[PDB]
Design a protein around this nucleic acid. Sequence first.
DNA 1: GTCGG
DNA 2: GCTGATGCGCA
DNA 3: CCGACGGCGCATCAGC
Length: 324
Amino acid sequence: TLNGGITDMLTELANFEKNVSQAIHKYNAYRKAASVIAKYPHKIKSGAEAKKLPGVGTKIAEKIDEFLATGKLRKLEKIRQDDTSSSINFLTRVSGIGPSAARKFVDEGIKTLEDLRKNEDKLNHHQRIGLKYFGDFEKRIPREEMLQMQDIVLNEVKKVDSEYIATVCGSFRRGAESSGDMDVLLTHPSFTSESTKQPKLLHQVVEQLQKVHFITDTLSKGETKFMGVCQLPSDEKEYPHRRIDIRLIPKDQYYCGVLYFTGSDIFNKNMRAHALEKGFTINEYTIRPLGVTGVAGEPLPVDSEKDIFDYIQWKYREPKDRSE
DNA sequence: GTCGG
DNA sequence: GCTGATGCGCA
DNA sequence: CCGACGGCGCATCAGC
Ligand SMILES: [Mn+2]
Ligand SMILES: [Mn+2]
Ligand SMILES: [Mn+2]
Ligand code: NA
Ligand code: NA
Ligand code: NA
């Protein structure tokens, strides 16, 4: 938080662009500026100082001058005052309500949590869950509870099949002290990039975790991806419900998978751009040599995380050093 | 909104 | 009833 | 001045 005041500003602007203006590239432009400024090891004294940073341009430098001078931004004060903008922004905080649903709701006079629960009939399954757990989903998960959650997932998965490998990635793996949710990567020897797709590989793990009442609600579920809600067991105080994502990936692509889902978000954006800046298209499933004409070769062999870094000549970075 | 064509 | 069109969330 | 900025699995539902 050397520059927390400025990064907060940029993030609020990013949010407005995505949620209200539905201008996704501006949204990303703002998050990119916020990321480069949060990594900047000095306290910013002016817009021109920030303008030296890649991702920070003319308009943001000026916004930075104003904030530094006035401690606020006029544009954001107006937005906050605007009823439509404010309400649309707010509704998107519900999991399942995006920019489109939010705007539609607001145009119909539906603009509060209260309005939402008064209109359950206009909500789909995922949005009802989102509404149901509104507060819970905005809470962080303390590492101590993440460790507890880890134990249960790994142990129930073993129970289904001793050769499954489940790895909790995301902020947890980076060693964060709180996480926004739990992301689990799942593998099994019988599922590889060749394979045949024998179904229920993921279903078996979801069913079991449901069986021990750890998973409490499903938002989406297919043969490779589960998105749902879970809760640690408790006269004592009930734990908050939490978001859990489970992804089943071909075993021979484990490391590209783990690398990607260990993140961060911006870090993986940073990784792919620089990747092509050395003749590779690193993605979530493979690393391939690229081509001037546009041909990416077959997936290079990968047997470790580090293996991936070597290819792309980045200084190795531990899970912890990947937040952006 | 920003940066490299 | 079906499905092409679109929305959502997401490292 | 201008255009690229990553893409996909899964759920819903308007328009047939
Ligand atoms: Mn997460
Ligand atoms: Mn997640
Ligand atoms: Mn279809
Ligand atoms: Na845009
Ligand atoms: Na700059
Ligand atoms: Na939302």
